[PDB]
Amino acid sequence: AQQERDVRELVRGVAGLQDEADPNFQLALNFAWSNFRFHRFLDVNSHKIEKTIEGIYEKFVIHSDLSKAASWKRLTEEFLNADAHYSILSLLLCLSDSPSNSSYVETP
Amino acid sequence: LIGKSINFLHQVCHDQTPTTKTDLENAFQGKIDAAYFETSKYLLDVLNKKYSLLDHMQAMRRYLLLGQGDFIRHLMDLLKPELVRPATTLYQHNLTGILETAVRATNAQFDSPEILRRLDVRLLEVSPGDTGWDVFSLDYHVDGPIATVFTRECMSHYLRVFNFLWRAKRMEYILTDIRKGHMCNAKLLRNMPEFSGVLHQCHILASEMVHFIHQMQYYITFEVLECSWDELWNKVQQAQDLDHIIAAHEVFLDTIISRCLLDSDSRALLNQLRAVFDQIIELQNAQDAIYRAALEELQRRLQFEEKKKEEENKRIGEFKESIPKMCSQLRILTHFYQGIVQQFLVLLTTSSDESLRFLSFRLDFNEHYKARE
Amino acid sequence: AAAAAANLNAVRETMDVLLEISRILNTGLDMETLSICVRLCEQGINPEALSSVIKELRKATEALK
């Protein structure tokens, strides 16, 4: 119930389709749910996600980005304390990754 | 110290001469110094010959500190077309063999198989983004008894300095490609009365980049890997303890971190230095952005001559439209670069006591930035 | 009660942690869209399934340009 409204709002936000009476909204939604029900991936391996997180930290340390390395270790260690964790992490990881070298600018 | 040395000599090296040999009527000052002498001297000898500590250091300068130069340029020269293509379709299979062609061509081929075996490729910390030029790294594996002098935490320093001196030696080659484009193309553009201005403006702007990428790159040569190498070579060549090797090795790495811009305080200076890495790849594109229009038309003009065997007046006209925008753009780029390098120098003056202070006098003799202050 | 309202505060704090994680990985997501993705991950789904869709609609917003 909540999940259906969630997939609606994801189409609205991500695709920029704020009118549900657009046929493109319903086509993107049908695409979304059909992709969701096409089970084709293995389940998330928490250990591989952990290894990837550590490797991101090492890449930060290698490039002498000390504030981003300290931030990265700090945020990942706080988040991993109270499955879905590794899911969201992997999700973000594959989603763009784009300027992982850039965009440091650690405000907090 | 003595008991640790003789226990290490049994449990690790496994080469044994069996039973290696007022206070309380004073036998201590007689026994202990002789024992200390014999034990430590044998331990140093057997570690530098049975597992060869020194030959690894010489290939840690040539390979990891990139100080060889012949291998390093010819390797990267053969490695350019791979790195220009994005790194998701690049693997170790294509790394090790082009390394091998470089190795058989260069001075590396004569050397011992141990140090050559211990150089092998690695991928730089694989993460999506398709950064083709960034994905390459050397992993030097130490798994002997000498691992204790070449521990994994100071190899990380080797990796970091290798990374910075990968970026810089990439940019230098981009720059000399610009300089090569000048000496190849411009003897064809002497037949242009209008592009002469903008190409000449690029000639003038380029030499400041060349200069900035050759003053830093002689400070990095002759004070970062020539003085540091010497003082380290002294402090290894005399040293008469395992501790004495290790505790000079560590601070040699730290001192080179202080000489370059990779300290926690000199991050601000490193940002200024990265802003010169912006402009060089910018100017590289602009130089070819000339030729893809400018050189392109003259062949078309030749074919227009073959037609005859009013159109081209408009090609003159659209160029007299195009030239001022490109020239003024180049002007603003020049201003921007000079201003940010002045901002680099003004923070540079008081950072460290001597090392970074000397760099100010290297990068400016002319005192252009006393007359542009 | 109170600790049930301290928990809604501690989830918003963890969400701000995720907001910095979102930008240092450089995702296109922000506070609004990731709020949807969290509830979806509560219901259970492949993250590789959600991400391919988001990779599609972020590039199918240029068919709505």
UniProtKB/Swiss-Prot annotation, chain A:
Expression tissues: Widely expressed, with highest levels in heart and skeletal muscle and moderate levels in brain.
Subcellular location: Cytoplasm, Cytoskeleton, Microtubule organizing center, Centrosome
Entry superkingdom: Eukaryota
Subunit structure: Component of the gamma-tubulin ring complex (gTuRC) consisting of TUBGCP2, TUBGCP3, TUBGCP4, TUBGCP5 and TUBGCP6 and gamma-tubulin TUBG1 or TUBG2. TUBGCP2, TUBGCP3, TUBGCP4, TUBGCP5 and TUBGCP6 assemble in a 5:5:2:1:1 stoichiometry; each is associated with a gamma-tubulin, thereby arranging 14 gamma-tubulins in a helical manner. Gamma-tubulin at the first position is blocked by TUBGCP3 at the last position, allowing 13 protafilaments to grow into a microtubule.
Function: Component of the gamma-tubulin ring complex (gTuRC) which mediates microtubule nucleation. The gTuRC regulates the minus-end nucleation of alpha-beta tubulin heterodimers that grow into microtubule protafilaments, a critical step in centrosome duplication and spindle formation.
Sequence similarity: Belongs to the TUBGCP family.
Designated name of the protein: Gamma-tubulin complex component 5
Shown part of the complete sequence: 13 to 130 of 1024
Curated annotation (Swiss-Prot), chain B:
Major localization listed first in the record, in broad terms: cytoplasm
GO biological process, one term: meiotic cell cycle
Keyword Chloroplast among record annotations: no
Tissue: Ubiquitously expressed.
Gene Ontology CC terms, in alphabetical order: centriole; centrosome; cytoplasm; cytosol; gamma-tubulin complex; membrane; polar microtubule; spindle
Molecular function as annotated in GO: gamma-tubulin binding; structural constituent of cytoskeleton; structural molecule activity
Domain of life of the organism encoding this protein: Eukaryota
Key words of the record: Acetylation, Cytoplasm, Cytoskeleton, Microtubule, Phosphoprotein
Transmembrane segments: none
Location of this chain's protein in the cell: Cytoplasm, Cytoskeleton, Microtubule organizing center, Centrosome
Subunit structure comment from the entry: Component of the gamma-tubulin ring complex (gTuRC) consisting of TUBGCP2, TUBGCP3, TUBGCP4, TUBGCP5 and TUBGCP6 and gamma-tubulin TUBG1 or TUBG2. TUBGCP2, TUBGCP3, TUBGCP4, TUBGCP5 and TUBGCP6 assemble in a 5:5:2:1:1 stoichiometry; each is associated with a gamma-tubulin, thereby arranging 14 gamma-tubulins in a helical manner. Gamma-tubulin at the first position is blocked by TUBGCP3 at the last position, allowing 13 protafilaments to grow into a microtubule.
Family: Belongs to the TUBGCP family.
Biological role stated in the UniProt entry: Component of the gamma-tubulin ring complex (gTuRC) which mediates microtubule nucleation. The gTuRC regulates the minus-end nucleation of alpha-beta tubulin heterodimers that grow into microtubule protafilaments, a critical step in centrosome duplication and spindle formation.
Protein name: Gamma-tubulin complex component 3
Organism the protein comes from: Homo sapiens
Organism placement in taxonomy: Eukaryota, Metazoa, Chordata, Craniata, Vertebrata
Entire protein: shown range: 485 to 890 of 907
Curated annotation (Swiss-Prot), chain C:
Species name: Homo sapiens (Human)
Disulfide bonds: none
A Gene Ontology term for the protein's cellular component: cytosol
Subunit composition and interactions: Associates with the gamma-tubulin ring complex (gTuRC) consisting of TUBGCP2, TUBGCP3, TUBGCP4, TUBGCP5 and TUBGCP6 and gamma-tubulin TUBG1 or TUBG2; within the complex, interacts with TUBGCP3 and TUBGCP6 to form a luminal bridge with actin that stabilizes the initial structure during complex assembly. Interacts with TUBG1.
Presence of keyword Transferase: no
Gene: MZT1
Role description: Required for the recruitment and the assembly of the gamma-tubulin ring complex (gTuRC) at the centrosome. The gTuRC regulates the minus-end nucleation of alpha-beta tubulin heterodimers that grow into microtubule protafilaments, a critical step in centrosome duplication and spindle formation.
Compartments, record wording: Cytoplasm, Cytoskeleton, Microtubule organizing center, Centrosome; Cytoplasm, Cytoskeleton, Spindle
Full protein name: Mitotic-spindle organizing protein 1
Family classification: Belongs to the MOZART1 family.
Domain of life (superkingdom): Eukaryota
GO biological process: gamma-tubulin complex localization; microtubule nucleation by interphase microtubule organizing center; mitotic spindle assembly
Main location: cytoplasm
Keyword tags: Acetylation, Cytoplasm, Cytoskeleton
